[PDB]
Amino acid sequence: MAAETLTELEAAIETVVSTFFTFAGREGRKGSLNINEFKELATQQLPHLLKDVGSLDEKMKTLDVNQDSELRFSEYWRLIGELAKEVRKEKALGIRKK
Amino acid sequence: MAAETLTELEAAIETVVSTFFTFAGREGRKGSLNINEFKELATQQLPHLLKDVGSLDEKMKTLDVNQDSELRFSEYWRLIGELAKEVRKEKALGIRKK
């Protein structure tokens, strides 16, 4: 089949949204999340296993990029490239069969 | 900060992977998941709330597209556009503040 609406994966959206995206709280209104606690990302995610390497500058620019990395209003499309942040490197590392 | 390695969202990868992606088992080897139970997607996800409309043909072609929608070996990048399948429509619907 095709990926029309929210597939079973939406249930997963609850984790990703209830985890880091909860930092939305930083911004008063109940619109979106910004890049305040996001700063807790590259920093804390810096030393991973198969780390990517949160380049300082990248960590700076990306703010504007994934500004609304989380959303309460319409910027949920931001999560689009978010949930992938995990899958990206996980594409290769996924090869548990080495 | 920037989305270098696996951010807190990776924890969410567990749901999406442990939910629908568990259909991988369809394929003997422990490499990847295909499009057998995926056929349970558009079909079941068909009648959603803000449904997208799993077009029959689309549901057919998408197979090849999201073939390894799930992965045990390297096709995890497939999940890249997967976890988003939820976020996509959820971008607008996200607007609980209407």
Side-chain angles (χ1 to χ4, degrees):
Chain A
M1 279 2 169
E4 32 150 291
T5 336
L6 285 99
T7 345
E8 324 309 271
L9 316 197
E10 36 131 283
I13 217 299
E14 293 298 275
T15 302
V16 56
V17 70
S18 297
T19 57
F20 165 53
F21 298 2
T22 65
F23 104 64
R26 293 286 72 197
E27 303 298 90
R29 184 63 178 187
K30 314 303 298 180
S32 46
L33 164 155
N34 194 30
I35 37 58
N36 188 89
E37 322 212 71
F38 194 119
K39 314 245 299 304
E40 88 97 83
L41 297 204
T43 42
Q44 305 297 90
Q45 77 200 153
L46 247 186
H48 240 280
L49 288 181
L50 186 59
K51 174 193 332 201
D52 186 273
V53 90
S55 190
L56 296 179
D57 37 89
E58 192 177 86
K59 299 165 50 196
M60 294 296 180
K61 24 171 62 181
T62 303
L63 275 97
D64 284 273
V65 180
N66 326 146
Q67 119 259 206
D68 287 318
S69 169
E70 142 68 354
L71 167 287
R72 332 308 328 275
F73 76 121
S74 44
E75 306 276 313
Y76 258 151
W77 59 65
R78 293 285 173 195
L79 320 185
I80 215 182
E82 289 313 291
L83 277 159
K85 302 157 54 221
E86 322 301 319
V87 172
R88 194 168 297 197
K89 56 236 68 281
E90 281 302 277
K91 77 184 184 182
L93 183 145
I95 68 200
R96 292 302 183 164
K97 344 303 157 171
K98 284 267 62 179
Chain B
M1 268 31 167
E4 30 149 292
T5 338
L6 285 98
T7 346
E8 322 311 271
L9 318 197
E10 36 130 285
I13 216 298
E14 292 298 275
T15 301
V16 56
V17 70
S18 297
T19 58
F20 165 55
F21 301 177
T22 61
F23 110 57
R26 289 287 75 195
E27 303 299 90
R29 184 63 176 187
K30 314 302 299 179
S32 47
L33 164 155
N34 191 29
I35 36 59
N36 187 90
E37 323 210 73
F38 197 118
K39 312 247 300 304
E40 87 96 83
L41 299 201
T43 44
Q44 307 295 91
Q45 77 197 152
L46 247 186
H48 238 284
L49 289 181
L50 186 59
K51 173 192 334 199
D52 185 273
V53 89
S55 192
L56 297 178
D57 36 89
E58 191 177 87
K59 296 164 52 194
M60 294 296 180
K61 31 168 60 179
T62 301
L63 276 97
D64 282 274
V65 179
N66 322 149
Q67 124 259 203
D68 287 318
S69 169
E70 141 69 354
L71 167 287
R72 332 309 327 276
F73 79 118
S74 43
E75 306 276 315
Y76 256 150
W77 58 63
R78 292 289 172 193
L79 321 183
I80 214 183
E82 290 312 291
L83 276 160
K85 305 156 49 217
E86 322 304 313
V87 173
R88 194 167 297 198
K89 57 235 66 282
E90 285 298 281
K91 76 184 184 182
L93 184 144
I95 65 203
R96 293 301 184 164
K97 344 303 154 170
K98 284 267 62 179

